[PDB]
Design a protein around this ligand. Structure first.
Ligand SMILES: CC(=O)/N=c1\sc(S(N)(=O)=O)nn1C
Ligand SMILES: [Zn+2]
Length: 259
């Protein structure tokens, strides 16, 4: 590898050389990659995909949030977990991070019926294994974010914290908030899409069971813009953090199912 991985926007916005997505190493060139476009009418209903159970999602916490140089990430340190969702085990929550742009019609990694959303939020969980690595070691819950004029009060603690972590490796503490504050209303999360894929940054390991919820989070345009306005890819603050999005990958011979 001749330089550090980057997103296209970083290569375009700086003279410092870096490895763009089509040139990424690791497992990034293998054939079960994410994100993908989901043709919603072609995903078959699987009745075994029931409701999710969220643990620790309703509890108010003061989360640590940090700029890791390619996103903003909340550290969930196993303080939450999930089960159900047609998942084979409970999964422990590790981190939450986001991908975004500064235009309403792009910013998501996945697309639904060829539509990208303003952001996409990933909550990353790790499988509770038994004795008897796997294709489903990691469960990522993906939520699409739609831009509008509705102020999302739940997001405010996160949005306000952004001012405090402009540069990579900076961390801060968010005001009291729960994970549910960040999500659509729980009852609306019964409809989701499911497929097997990869992590969307190097080394892009093919060990993710993906869930993409049908119901979008509503965020005000200016709450979304706060991400590109307050954050930077680099300590020199030369490239505002936005378009931290991997281009679409081919489904190949994989199948997408839905609840
Ligand atoms: C270690 C870890 O969780 N990193 C991640 S989370 C992730 S993502 N964007 O959720 O698929 N991609 N990568 C590389
Ligand atoms: Zn992600």
């Amino acid at each position: 590898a001749e330089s550090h991985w980057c997103y296209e926007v970083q290569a375009e916005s700086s003279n410092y050389p870096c490895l763009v997505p089509v040139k990424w190493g690791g497992n990034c060139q293998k054939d079960r990659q994410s994100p993908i476009n989901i043709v919603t009418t072609k995903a078959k209903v699987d009745k075994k995909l029931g409701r999710f159970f969220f643990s620790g999602y309703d509890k108010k916490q003061t989360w640590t949030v940090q700029n890791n140089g390619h996103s903003v990430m909340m550290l969930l340190e196993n303080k939450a977990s999930i089960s159900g969702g047609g998942l084979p085990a409970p999964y422990q929550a590790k981190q939450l991070h986001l991908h975004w742009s500064d235009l309403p019609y792009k910013g998501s990694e996945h697309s639904l019926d060829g539509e990208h959303f303003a952001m996409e939020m990933h909550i990353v969980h790790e499988k509770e294994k038994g004795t008897s690595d796997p294709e489903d070691e990691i469960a990522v819950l993906a939520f699409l974010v739609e831009a509008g004029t509705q102020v999302n009060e739940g997001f405010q603690p996160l949005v306000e914290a952004l001012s405090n972590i402009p540069k990579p490796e900076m961390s801060t503490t968010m005001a009291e908030s729960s994970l549910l504050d960040l999500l659509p209303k729980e009852e609306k999360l019964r409809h989701y899409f499911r497929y097997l894929g990869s992590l969307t940054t190097p080394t892009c390991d093919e060990k993710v069971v993906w869930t993409v919820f049908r119901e979008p989070i509503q965020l005000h345009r200016e709450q979304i813009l706060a991400f590109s306005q307050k954050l930077y890819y680099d300590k020199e603050q030369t490239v505002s953090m936005k378009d931290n999005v991997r281009p679409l990958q081919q489904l190949g011979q994989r199948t997408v199912i839905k609840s």
